[PDB]
Design a protein around this ligand. Structure first.
Ligand SMILES: [Mg+2]
Ligand SMILES: [Mg+2]
Ligand SMILES: [Mg+2]
Ligand SMILES: [Mg+2]
Ligand SMILES: [Mg+2]
Ligand SMILES: [Mg+2]
Ligand SMILES: [Mg+2]
Ligand SMILES: [Mg+2]
Ligand SMILES: [Mg+2]
Ligand SMILES: [Mg+2]
Ligand SMILES: [Mg+2]
Ligand SMILES: [Zn+2]
Lengths: 156, 211, 205, 87, 99, 45, 123, 100
RNA sequence: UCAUGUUCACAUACACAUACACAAACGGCGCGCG
RNA sequence: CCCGCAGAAGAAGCACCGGCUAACUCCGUGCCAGCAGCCGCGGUAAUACGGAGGGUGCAAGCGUUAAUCGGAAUUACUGGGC
């Protein structure tokens, strides 16, 4: 049921006594499609085993994001190692008009209307971690009104 | 590094010979030549019968072929007709009266030469070598082999540079002379050359040493 | 301004049936549809993402017979019209007059419908329209004129339209050789396989 | 549906229409070379429902995401084929 | 002959009958009076629904048995829904009722 | 389309096919049990 | 940087120079080859590529590259030149136009004839 | 259901509804083409005498048949009695987990 | 105490095995067992 | 603009196919000839040079060069850093 898709399969290397030992790392993102997402990063000698380990890691440690009807709650910025991300909620029918890995994450999280941009570096790993950060640190009216102690109609 | 032929180094200790006879220096070479010819023609004929192992045994009055394969139905057919015809042809090749006996191997997945022929057929029909090897290893392990190790070599998937890929699943000890390591090799003749295939299959450390 | 090459070739390239022939004879009998066109057809190299966006665009464009400049113009018109860009694009493309003719069945294929609309057999509200890409507006009485109302191919295509399943937003009377456009088609009233989003994002790259 | 009694009566014409999902028109069932049900015959997949497990007849849709869309190639509803015995 | 599970008929989902088919024995009419003549109600409920006819309950039962839970959810047999439609296929409006 | 009798059966290995001959019929004198393939028929598509 | 410093001395965007100055923002310019010669490329390539020291109309003297397989040019020849660097001839920032005043047509080109100024053969 | 090769099992009701719908197709035609009383009383009789088959074949003067005088089983023949739902499939039915 | 080493040149997203899921049905006519 | 006239009859190119980028095989040649927007290809089996066939993309045009903006958060007021 969990819709899952890989993003980047890179071939990394380690030099050893004889020559070079190659190895692949696949970074995949899974999500139920209703608001719970999670990314995983696997590495192995072969692409299939790599992807499968990545997907196991991703199927564990998923998070919740306070969703509002296939779009976000408020403009949110996130920063990780090199990537910086700006994700803005958008109107109905806009589409997931965003970068590559950003598209992947938001799409499996289920968000169908979002304006995104990846300032700074574009390294898929950091951009995905920054997107997950920017999706996590988004609170919904319920959350914020609970946190201040009012009604949902007082904060709006 | 260069390895020792496992079946060879285990001969006498664990494995039994293929050919079994005694003949003095005058007869020996001719015995060996006849056996080479009969094995040649036998393989060429039963390319499809999945012939694991021939055994030649001539008790000085005849020749007894004992052929372990997985398709007695295919090598025999209706009422031993192909059997007896092959027998008369073997008799003409060898130059003595002949006799064929067929043994049926139960697990076609655990015989080295059988696995080799299967992988070679897959490669000749141009399947993905990686997937072929993986499926072979899974078949053998799920059948229950204590260990198995396969290796394909050369021009893998039509590449210019050759290299050797190999998988090992479980434990396959070679230096343990009392370990029944089945071994075999094969050649897949593809449009880019020969692709070699080696298969070790470790079945168990048999301590008594029967034959 | 028109594609003049083999049609089943396009069908093979897409993979699907694009309905470029009348469908009297089965496509499996006319060609190996399960195979890409040419010597190097039998191969599915993992398609790129932009590649599949392109493929969807080509599928729709070669179902409808629209060159890419006109198709990008349609895309822009859709971007202008408010609402959902995909459904709007489908609305324009379907509202094409040659498409309305093929829909009401006065032509075996959309190619034949364009042929007759070009050779002046089609009249909207008594005014003979010669441009196949005319934009039929809602509640337009589009008729066939007499001179090509004798056309044997026209009548045979009427029968084959009775063979096809009829669209719901078009009221066409065969005996009177007269259709009427009533309402813009719904996405659900068009074929479902085509994904709006592919074309949308492809042009909004 | 849970219940706790049973009632029987004559069905008025409007009730009988209400039970309907379509009106049958053609005296036919399935083709005699291929074996698709002939539309508006006694098996028409758009009257009663789709034949394939959770996927549609015209081929346009084959995944639970489309569950409950009605196509416009032939007009079938994509739904549980189990309901083909219900309607 | 013996059957754990296997085929079911198409018109109504009760098991096939046979040895030439992997069939279930008929718990026929007289046996049901025999259960009713003990107090045995749950046995009967099972025998003619969960073990037999209820297209949900039998797959939930099977899983509860492999789980070893020894519990059933009994529902309502689909052969009886066949009856309703075969009457409602006459102009006879039969229906289930609530209170 | 037309069927074939064969040993080239899809989705089955020598573990079963060992009793067929090369034509696609069981050997006479084969001793058989449940699930043995006696005749390797196959259908197109 | 403080808004105050930016006020005192605004930000003046980096100016990206022309990559082809001798064309003077004009798509092609005429030339008269002073000297046609061959030069060897830079690592890792190896060839003997054909280049002409050419005198523009405006007075600049550049080194133009001679595309296509085979040329019939010499000195005192009127050519037309366009932009684009060769790369493996460091210091050559112009191409010659094939099929121009003296830059003749290539022979037996059946693909990219528009690139190389060759006629449409008997078709 | 198909059986041994490309043949459908003669599935009785679909022969009865086929009778009805054929007759109804004709009757709509002959009504709208405005046939005279004697013709429509023909088809209207044949239709009433067909729906008679579909409901309870054989309470008519004679049961209709499609073989060597085998009467086709109609709906009311599926409800009632010794081979019909109430006795055959509801009151007592075949069960899994059994053997003999 | 102990210098130098000509130029270029080294495997990459799992789009399956005679897409996932999918294991024999209904009526006569008989014979026989209980 | 309309009506009538006979005839498929009078009307298809250009670029690209190693990756970015949609779309491959054979031959010719052998770090030569050559290509090239960037990475690179070519030193006797060239999917990258040339030819062929095949295909892909645009279409009465297609490509090349020149020019600006965007991409470039790459003068960072919105929106950088030491
Ligand atoms: Mg400069
Ligand atoms: Mg020196
Ligand atoms: Mg050095
Ligand atoms: Mg490509
Ligand atoms: Mg070129
Ligand atoms: Mg060559
Ligand atoms: Mg290239
Ligand atoms: Mg080339
Ligand atoms: Mg134009
Ligand atoms: Mg800027
Ligand atoms: Mg900086
Ligand atoms: Zn559909």
């Amino acid at each position: 049921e969990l819709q899952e898709k890989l993003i980047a399969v890179n071939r990394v290397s380690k030099t050893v006594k004889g020559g070079r030992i190659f190895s692949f790392t696949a970074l995949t993102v899974v999500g139920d499609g209703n608001g719970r997402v999670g990314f995983g990063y696997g590495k192995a000698r072969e692409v299939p085993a790599a992807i499968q380990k990545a997907m196991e890691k991703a199927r564990r440690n998923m998070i919740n994001v306070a969703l509002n009807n296939g779009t976000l709650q408020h403009p949110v910025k996130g920063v990780h190692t090199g990537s910086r991300v700006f994700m803005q909620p958008a109107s109905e029918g806009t589409g997931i008009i965003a970068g590559g890995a950003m598209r992947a994450v938001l799409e499996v999280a289920g968000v169908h209307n979002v304006l995104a941009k990846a300032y700074g570096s574009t390294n898929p790993i950091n951009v995905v971690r920054a997107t997950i950060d920017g999706l996590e640190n988004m609170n919904s009216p319920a959350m914020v009104a609970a946190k201040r102690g009012k009604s949902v109609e007082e904060i709006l | 590094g260069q390895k020792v032929h496992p079946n060879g180094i285990r001969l006498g200790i664990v494995k039994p010979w293929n050919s079994t006879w005694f003949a003095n220096t005058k007869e020996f070479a001719d015995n060996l030549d006849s056996d080479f010819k009969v094995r040649q023609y036998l393989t060429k004929e039963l390319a499809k019968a999945s012939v694991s192992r021939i055994v030649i045994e001539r008790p000085a009055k005849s020749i007894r072929v004992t052929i372990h394969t997985a398709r007695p139905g295919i090598v025999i057919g209706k009422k031993g007709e192909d059997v007896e015809k092959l027998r008369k042809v073997v008799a003409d090749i060898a130059g003595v009266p002949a006799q064929i006996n067929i043994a049926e191997v139960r697990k076609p997945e655990l015989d080295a030469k059988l696995v080799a022929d299967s992988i070679t057929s897959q490669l000749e029909r141009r399947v993905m070598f990686r997937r072929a090897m993986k499926r072979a290893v899974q078949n053998a392990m799920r059948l229950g082999a204590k260990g198995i190790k396969v290796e394909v070599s050369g021009r893998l998937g039509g590449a210019e540079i050759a290299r050797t890929e190999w998988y090992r699943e479980g434990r396959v000890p070679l230096h343990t002379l009392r370990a029944d390591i089945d071994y075999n090799t094969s050649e897949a003749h593809t449009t880019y050359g020969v692709i070699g295939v080696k298969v070790w299959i470790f079945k168990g450390e048999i301590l008594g040493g029967m034959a | 301004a028109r594609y003049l090459g083999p049609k089943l070739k396009l069908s093979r390239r897409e993979g699907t049936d694009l309905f470029l022939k009348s469908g009297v004879r089965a496509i499996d009998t006319k060609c190996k549809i399960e195979q890409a066109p040419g010597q190097h057809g039998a191969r599915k190299p993992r398609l790129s993402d932009y590649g599949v966006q392109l493929r969807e665009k080509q599928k729709v464009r070669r179902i409808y017979g629209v060159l890419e400049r006109q198709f990008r113009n349609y895309y822009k018109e859709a971007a202008r019209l408010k609402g959902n860009t995909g459904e709007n694009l489908l609305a324009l493309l379907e509202g094409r007059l040659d498409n309305v003719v093929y829909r009401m069945g006065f032509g075996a294929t959309r190619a034949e419908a364009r042929q007759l609309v070009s050779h002046k057999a089609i009249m909207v509200n008594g005014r003979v329209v010669n441009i196949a890409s005319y934009q039929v507006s809602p509640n337009d009485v589009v008729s066939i004129r007499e001179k090509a109302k004798k056309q044997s191919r026209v009548k045979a295509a009427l029968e084959l339209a009775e063979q096809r399943e009829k669209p719901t937003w078009l009221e066409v009377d065969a005996g009177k050789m007269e259709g009427t456009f009533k309402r813009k088609p719904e996405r659900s009233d068009l074929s479902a396989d085509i994904n709006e989003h592919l074309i949308v994002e492809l042009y909004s790259k | 549906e849970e219940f706790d009694a049973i009632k029987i009566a004559l069905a008025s014409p409007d009730m009988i229409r209400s039970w309907s999902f379509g009106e049958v028109k053609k005296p036919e069932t399935i083709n005699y070379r291929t074996f698709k049900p002939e539309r508006d015959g006694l098996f028409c997949a758009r009257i009663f429902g789709p034949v394939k497990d959770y996927e549609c007849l015209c081929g346009k849709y084959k995944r639970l995401k489309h569950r409950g869309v009605i196509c416009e190639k032939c007009g079938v509803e994509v739904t549980q084929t189990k309901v083909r015995r219900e309607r | 002959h013996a059957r754990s599970t296997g085929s079911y008929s198409l018109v109504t989902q009760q098991p096939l009958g046979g040895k030439a088919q992997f069939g279930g024995q008929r718990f026929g009419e007289m046996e049901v009076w025999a259960l009713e003549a003990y107090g045995a109600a749950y046995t009967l409920q099972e025998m003619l629904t969960v073990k037999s006819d209820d297209v949900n309950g039998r797959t939930k039962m099977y899983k509860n048995i492999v789980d070893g839970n020894h519990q059933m959810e009994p529902g309502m047999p689909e052969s009886f829904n066949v009856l309703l439609k075969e009457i409602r296929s006459l102009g006879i409006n039969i229906e289930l009722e609530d209170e | 389309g037309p069927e074939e009798i064969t040993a080239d059966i899809p989705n089955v290995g020598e573990a079963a096919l060992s009793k067929l001959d090369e034509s696609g019929i069981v050997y006479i004198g084969a001793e058989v049990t449940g699930g043995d393939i006696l005749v390797g028929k196959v259908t197109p598509k | 940087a403080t808004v105050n410093q930016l006020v005192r001395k605004p930000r003046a965007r980096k100016v990206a120079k022309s990559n082809v100055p001798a064309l003077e923002a004009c798509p092609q310019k005429r030339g008269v080859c002073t000297r046609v010669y061959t030069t060897t490329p830079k690592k890792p390539n190896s060839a003997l590529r054909k280049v002409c020291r050419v005198r523009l109309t405006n007075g600049f003297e550049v080194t133009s590259y001679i595309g296509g397989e085979g040329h019939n040019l010499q000195e005192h020849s009127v050519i037309l030149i366009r932009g684009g660097r060769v790369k493996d001839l460091p210091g050559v920032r112009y191409h010659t136009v094939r099929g121009a005043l003296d830059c003749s047509g290539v022979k037996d080109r059946k693909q990219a004839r528009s690139k190389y100024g060759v006629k449409r053969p008997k078709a | 259901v198909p059986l041994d090769g490309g043949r459908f099992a003669t599935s009785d009701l679909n022969d009865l509804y086929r009778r009805v719908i054929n007759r109804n197709n004709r009757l709509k035609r002959l009504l709208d083409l405005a046939a005279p009383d004697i013709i429509v009383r023909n088809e209207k009789r044949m239709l009433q005498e067909a729906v008679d088959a579909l409901l309870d074949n054989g309470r008519r003067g004679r049961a209709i048949t499609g073989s060597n005088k085998r009467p086709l089983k109609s709906l009311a023949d599926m409800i009632k009695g010794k081979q019909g739902r109430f006795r055959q499939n509801l009151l007592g039915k075949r069960v899994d987990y059994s053997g003999r």
